Design a protein around this ligand. Structure first.
Ligand SMILES: Nc1ncnc2c1ncn2[C@@H]1O[C@@H]2CO[P@](=O)(S)O[C@@H]3[C@H](O)[C@@H](CO[P@](=O)(S)O[C@H]2[C@H]1O)O[C@H]3n1cnc2c(N)ncnc21
Length: 384
């Protein structure tokens, strides 16, 4: 088991996030194969996915740590297979709502796999394993996106044959997941553990970083595609994913003194993200779109550089074997913050503003987050 703890785990992550037909779900639901209603794919499947994400995350993060991370990893593949079987069979919109529910089910085994790595390896290579696995995950996402875009734009095969390839790769991912080794008032136990671990400085900082910076990252990523909506969009996404994989690898390889040079790093990367968001918002010249794409890929790399470090620091600082619960509560809070900000600002009944203004307030949001982190770094060090 000298390779099947890191090398095989990273290979499984790479093979699990290979779904060439995942980005083409909406066109497939709109093409001649499975002709649907334009409003149905908007008011019937997107809302059910959005609500079921939280409704499924709530028990997943509670149960994955107790289940020892193997059942949830297998359930990810089984639910992806169910999603694609529903996509292939199709039938009525009830099947599509079931497909979106199963997709929301898959969305939380992300946190399951993220917490698996630190329960697989010893608490001395957490950073190098977090970087390896995040790099493998982002490489898998990039390979899936490239595979899909190459098959449709170049190979022009179909939206069904691409889905068959996706089904084959998902079944192989399930086969791989079956061979992963299983690590060896519970509600009150978890509540007491969280109450005791919140007081730690390294868990609290990276927990408050996850629930806010990631929520800002989701908001920017979602609103970039709204602004974008083209070959120069999927290409930008693939470049951003490759840069994210490379930066996750670097984070798994970087060796600095943490708990002293940590809040400064967070503040610096957040300020860089705020600058890139400002550049994205304040650039509309016709001969400047490549600069916008470069800003997007740099923002994605900046965010994905900290995710392995955040996971390693949340796992290392924990004194109990339930890193899955902390990862899940952070992801749940990030999604809740994103939903709250969208409802408060983006809603028509709320302070409804165009996409450019949306990026202006998100630029100032990243700015104030960076300012708060820099102020924390200037107030903790001043109390040396
Ligand atoms: N084709 C599209 N055009 C424009 N915007 C889109 C979009 N597909 C999604 N988004 C949006 O991007 C935001 C960030 O996405 P990611 O950060 S790049 O990944 C998200 C995130 O991990 C999670 C919660 O993030 P979330 O708060 S619910 O918001 C998402 C999502 O609504 O949902 C994941 N996710 C992955 N694939 C899908 C999908 N097919 N549908 C909905 N969510 C999806």
């Amino acid at each position: 088991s000298w390779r099947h703890l890191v090398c095989y785990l990273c290979f499984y992550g790479f093979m699990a996030q290979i779904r060439p037909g995942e980005s083409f779900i909406t066109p497939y639901l709109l093409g001649p194969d499975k002709q649907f209603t334009r409003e149905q794919v908007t008011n019937e499947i997107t809302p059910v996915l959005s609500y079921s994400y939280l409704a499924v995350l709530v028990p997943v993060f509670l149960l994955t740590d107790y289940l020892r991370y193997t059942p949830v990893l297998l359930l990810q593949g089984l639910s992806f297979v169910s999603v694609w079987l529903l996509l292939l069979l199709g039938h009525s919109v009830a099947h599509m709502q079931l497909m979106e529910l199963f997709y929301s089910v898959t969305m939380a085994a992300r946190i399951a796999y993220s917490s698996y790595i630190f329960s697989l390896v010893r608490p001395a290579r957490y950073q190098r394993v977090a970087g390896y696995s995040r790099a493998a995950v982002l490489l898998g996402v990039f390979t899936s996106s490239v595979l899909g875009q190459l098959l449709v734009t170049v190979g022009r095969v179909s939206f069904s044959t691409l889905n068959y390839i996706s089904l084959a790769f998902l079944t192989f991912s399930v086969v791989l997941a079956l061979f992963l080794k299983r690590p060896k008032s519970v509600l009150a136990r978890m509540l007491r553990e969280l109450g005791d671990s919140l007081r730690r400085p390294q868990l609290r900082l990276w927990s408050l970083w996850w629930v806010f910076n990631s929520a800002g990252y989701y908001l920017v990523v979602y609103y970039v595609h709204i602004l974008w909506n083209r070959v120069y969009n999927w290409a930008a996404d693939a470049a951003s994913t490759l840069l994210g994989a490379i930066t996750s690898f670097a984070a798994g390889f970087v060796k600095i003194r943490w708990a002293r040079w940590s809040k400064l790093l967070i503040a610096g990367v957040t300020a860089t993200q705020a600058g890139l968001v400002f550049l994205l918002a304040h650039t509309r010249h016709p001969s400047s779109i490549w600069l916008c794409y470069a800003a997007f890929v740099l923002f994605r790399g900046s965010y994905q550089f900290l995710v392995p470090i955040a996971t390693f620091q949340i796992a290392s600082s924990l004194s109990k074997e339930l890193c899955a619960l902390v990862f899940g509560v952070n992801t749940f809070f990030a999604t809740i913050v994103k939903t709250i900000i969208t409802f408060i600002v983006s809603d028509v009944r709320g302070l409804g503003l165009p996409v450019r203004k949306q990026f202006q307030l998100y630029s100032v949001y990243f700015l104030i987050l960076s300012i708060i982190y820099f102020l924390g770094a200037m107030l903790d060090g001043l109390r040396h």
